[PDB]
Amino acid sequence: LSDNGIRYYQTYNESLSLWPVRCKSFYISTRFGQTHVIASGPEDAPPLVLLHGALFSSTMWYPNIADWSSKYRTYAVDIIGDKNKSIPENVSGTRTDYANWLLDVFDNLGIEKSHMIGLSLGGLHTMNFLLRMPERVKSAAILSPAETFLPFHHDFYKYALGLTASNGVETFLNWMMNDQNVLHPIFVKQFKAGVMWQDGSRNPNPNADGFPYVFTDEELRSARVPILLLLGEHEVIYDPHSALHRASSFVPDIEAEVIKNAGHVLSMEQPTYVNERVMRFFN
Amino acid sequence: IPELSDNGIRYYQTYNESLSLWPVRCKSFYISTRFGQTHVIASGPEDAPPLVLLHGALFSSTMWYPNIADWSSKYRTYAVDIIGDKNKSIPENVSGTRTDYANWLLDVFDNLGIEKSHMIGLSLGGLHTMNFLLRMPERVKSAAILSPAETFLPFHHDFYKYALGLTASNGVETFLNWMMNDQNVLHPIFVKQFKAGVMWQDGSRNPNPNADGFPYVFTDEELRSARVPILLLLGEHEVIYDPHSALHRASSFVPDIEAEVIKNAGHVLSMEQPTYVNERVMRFFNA
Ligand SMILES: [Cl-]
Ligand SMILES: [Mg+2]
């Protein structure tokens, strides 16, 4: 770990101070590297897996974990290769690799079947997984997924490219959060330290067979596990209504909605609503 | 306008070393504008007709080292650092609008005392060139547009995917290996500067993204409004978009355009095939 990486790890730990319940941080071994997991909830309760949005880490679930972990043994898994505490190894970058990584996580956590919640990148990993390992998923809540139904609008790339510039994180977040005062300052400090940390592990080369990815009509038609799709009305990475329409056109028996007064990071903007909505779906 | 950071100092060091590649006498100076202090490198005979060069994104005016001996033998050549891009120009309150970028270049022309000038732009500089010539035709003689950023077609998403990786371990070699077809064409000193600029992240702010700014694709009617002679050169191995589709579109709409896809070249064609590119553009401007 470099000095920027040490500093990022520090900010991550401070961000856990926001976690309103007791949790345990630990590493699990996989074929693609040591994977960080935060576990919460009763040991004997049914399992729930959380996969975070890009660059945000597992720490982002602080406004949701008190409600979700009351009933489920919840595992917030740091996505291998993204900006967080997981340490990737031998990742070619294919959708198959990422699916196998998560399978190793389920396997090492003792999970047979589980409920899943993914936001942004985690939403894309969730769709990928349920399509490949359907017998391991009870049902899945996909929230503002990265691509999946529609390609990224070029605005996303324009703002993302300016992240690593003076005032780039503020600019990026203001665009994504619709200029709303939502994120706790401590978490923002972590997000920024992640952005500053650029000498860590290498990214896999861009790959048509990796992520981000838009599923074909026939791939969407093949979904076999129940899905809840939540999008925000103020989503900026693609048009939310168009995404819902494409999802509804092909994913059989989907439950889906565009949430008023929320955008992309809807789990942090409208936790009370989102917390109950997802729980209602899992029941 | 922050004091120059340690990474900024390192970038300035690399910019200076890269200027050692310039095979002709030059001068570095600044032009004061409503929009900031614009860095310019001037070369060629002082009374010769003017030529303005506009570099591609993140590369700076130092990128013209393989072309300047030929071009400045004939023209008083001004290599202008695009205001707000990663280079020696110091931006102040740049809105980032297409109108304001044209007004910025007009002030540069006015300060340099230019009436009409030939212009050469590559990538981002090509997009500034098309924008400027459509708005201010009376200030342009003819224009060479080389591998322009968007302009005719939108960027293929891979551009963005590779660009986003620039600030990662091995991000620059990955980006360059992709854009340059795994070839070793850039001078190591120039690459050291390109990398130093990528690492210099605490300088100026960027204008906020804006549909009324760059990058941009001109409409059919906009393309049809062109009223100066234009040369479009594209590379057979272009990666930011399909060069043949871009050529077809340009030819269909820009009146009297001269356009060709160059062999054994990709995006940064001026550094990949300088001998050919140098004569071709001079031929175009000469008669
Ligand atoms: Cl209900
Ligand atoms: Mg001629």
Side-chain angles (χ1 to χ4, degrees), chain A residues 1-43 45-169 171-201 203-259 261-283, chain B residues 2 4-45 47-172 174-262 264-287:
Chain A
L1 261 191
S2 67
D3 288 359
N4 281 344
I6 287 175
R7 290 183 193 93
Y8 171 74
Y9 271 47
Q10 290 166 200
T11 59
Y12 188 119
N13 292 329
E14 298 164 23
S15 280
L16 284 177
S17 76
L18 302 170
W19 213 262
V21 293
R22 196 70 193 165
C23 67
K24 169 182 66 161
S25 295
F26 61 98
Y27 279 98
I28 278 284
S29 181
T30 72
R31 275 172 278 166
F32 299 99
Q34 291 283 301
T35 298
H36 192 266
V37 183
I38 307 171
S40 291
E43 288 176 24
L48 173 61
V49 175
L50 314 182
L51 301 177
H52 57 84
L55 314 176
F56 272 23
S57 81
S58 294
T59 69
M60 64 163 282
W61 299 114
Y62 68 88
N64 316 101
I65 198 72
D67 289 328
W68 294 338
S69 72
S70 59
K71 165 168 183 42
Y72 297 96
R73 175 59 170 178
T74 306
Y75 300 101
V77 178
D78 272 348
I79 298 166
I80 207 72
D82 191 21
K83 202 64 61 71
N84 59 37
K85 278 205 182 171
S86 293
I87 310 167
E89 297 187 56
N90 304 320
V91 171
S92 65
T94 68
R95 294 186 299 276
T96 297
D97 289 338
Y98 290 125
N100 286 347
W101 160 74
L102 192 53
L103 191 66
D104 286 350
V105 175
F106 274 47
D107 285 345
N108 289 41
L109 288 175
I111 301 178
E112 284 304 327
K113 282 200 159 189
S114 181
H115 285 297
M116 303 184 67
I117 294 172
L119 186 146
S120 164
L121 183 63
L124 177 55
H125 280 249
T126 293
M127 178 63 62
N128 190 59
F129 193 78
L130 73 76
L131 292 179
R132 287 162 180 265
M133 275 97 182
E135 80 288 355
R136 302 300 285 272
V137 194
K138 302 193 187 172
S139 68
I142 302 182
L143 283 49
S144 301
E147 298 205 325
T148 301
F149 308 106
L150 296 181
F152 286 135
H153 190 285
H154 280 200
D155 277 357
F156 164 67
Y157 286 123
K158 290 168 183 179
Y159 281 93
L161 273 168
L163 269 177
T164 57
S166 313
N167 197 52
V169 164
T171 302
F172 180 85
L173 292 178
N174 279 351
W175 167 75
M176 179 172 67
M177 316 294 279
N178 214 57
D179 304 301
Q180 307 305 303
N181 196 36
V182 183
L183 299 173
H184 188 297
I186 287 180
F187 178 78
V188 177
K189 291 179 179 298
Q190 177 190 356
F191 174 69
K192 177 54 167 289
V195 173
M196 292 290 307
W197 178 32
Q198 301 169 16
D199 48 16
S201 293
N203 293 324
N205 292 348
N207 193 342
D209 303 339
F211 292 139
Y213 181 61
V214 183
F215 294 93
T216 63
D217 300 348
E218 188 56 26
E219 290 179 313
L220 296 180
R221 288 195 193 88
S222 81
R224 296 173 63 212
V225 325
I227 292 166
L228 172 67
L229 181 59
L230 306 179
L231 297 152
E233 76 172 305
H234 306 307
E235 179 53 82
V236 288
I237 63 160
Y238 44 63
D239 187 278
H241 294 290
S242 186
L244 190 150
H245 175 268
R246 188 164 181 259
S248 305
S249 293
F250 303 106
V251 167
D253 306 310
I254 195 175
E255 301 198 358
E257 73 188 65
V258 175
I259 302 182
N261 302 293
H264 186 70
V265 193
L266 55 90
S267 64
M268 309 184 87
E269 289 164 330
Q270 299 288 351
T272 299
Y273 180 77
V274 170
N275 289 354
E276 189 279 345
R277 182 70 193 85
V278 171
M279 298 195 91
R280 200 199 317 161
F281 179 65
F282 295 159
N283 267 52
Chain B
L4 198 57
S5 72
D6 286 12
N7 286 339
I9 288 162
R10 286 174 196 110
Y11 176 73
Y12 270 51
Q13 286 164 196
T14 61
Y15 190 117
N16 226 43
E17 300 169 21
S18 289
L19 274 182
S20 72
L21 305 179
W22 218 255
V24 294
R25 170 183 285 175
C26 64
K27 76 163 174 184
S28 299
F29 60 108
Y30 291 82
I31 301 314
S32 173
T33 93
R34 290 170 270 159
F35 315 90
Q37 300 299 312
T38 301
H39 187 243
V40 187
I41 306 170
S43 302
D47 293 317
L51 175 61
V52 172
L53 309 179
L54 288 174
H55 59 76
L58 313 191
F59 268 27
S60 85
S61 292
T62 62
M63 67 160 280
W64 300 117
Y65 69 85
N67 320 100
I68 198 66
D70 284 3
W71 293 342
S72 72
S73 62
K74 184 167 182 173
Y75 303 103
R76 182 57 172 162
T77 301
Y78 300 101
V80 174
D81 270 357
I82 296 175
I83 199 87
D85 192 25
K86 197 62 62 63
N87 59 43
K88 271 183 144 77
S89 288
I90 302 168
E92 282 212 43
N93 314 332
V94 175
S95 63
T97 71
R98 292 194 303 270
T99 311
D100 283 339
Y101 284 129
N103 290 337
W104 158 77
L105 197 53
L106 197 62
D107 287 336
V108 170
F109 275 44
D110 284 341
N111 290 33
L112 292 174
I114 291 175
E115 282 287 339
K116 287 187 162 185
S117 179
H118 290 309
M119 299 183 69
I120 297 164
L122 186 139
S123 205
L124 174 60
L127 171 51
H128 277 252
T129 294
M130 182 62 58
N131 188 56
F132 183 79
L133 76 79
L134 291 173
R135 292 173 179 267
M136 313 283 171
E138 76 289 345
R139 307 301 291 271
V140 189
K141 297 186 191 169
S142 57
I145 297 164
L146 282 38
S147 302
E150 295 204 331
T151 308
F152 301 111
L153 298 174
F155 287 134
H156 184 267
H157 272 223
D158 288 348
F159 169 73
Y160 286 126
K161 292 168 172 173
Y162 278 97
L164 272 169
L166 281 171
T167 46
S169 38
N170 201 36
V172 167
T174 307
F175 182 83
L176 294 179
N177 283 331
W178 169 72
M179 177 177 57
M180 319 266 273
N181 190 15
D182 300 296
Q183 308 300 346
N184 194 58
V185 174
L186 307 183
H187 194 290
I189 289 172
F190 179 76
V191 179
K192 289 188 208 77
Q193 184 197 349
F194 173 68
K195 179 69 164 299
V198 175
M199 296 289 85
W200 178 33
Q201 302 166 15
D202 49 22
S204 313
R205 297 185 188 175
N206 302 309
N208 294 349
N210 179 4
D212 292 325
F214 298 140
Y216 179 71
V217 181
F218 298 94
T219 66
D220 292 353
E221 187 43 71
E222 275 166 341
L223 290 182
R224 282 195 294 267
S225 62
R227 289 159 41 192
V228 301
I230 298 167
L231 176 64
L232 173 63
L233 302 186
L234 299 167
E236 73 173 323
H237 306 303
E238 175 57 277
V239 291
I240 70 162
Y241 49 56
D242 176 8
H244 304 286
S245 165
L247 194 160
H248 186 249
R249 179 165 192 250
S251 291
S252 299
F253 293 108
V254 180
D256 303 314
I257 191 162
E258 290 192 29
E260 68 196 53
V261 176
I262 299 179
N264 303 322
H267 188 68
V268 199
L269 50 76
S270 58
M271 313 181 86
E272 292 171 320
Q273 297 298 327
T275 297
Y276 181 87
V277 167
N278 292 345
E279 187 280 342
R280 185 69 189 88
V281 178
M282 288 183 93
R283 195 206 307 157
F284 174 76
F285 291 165
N286 185 55

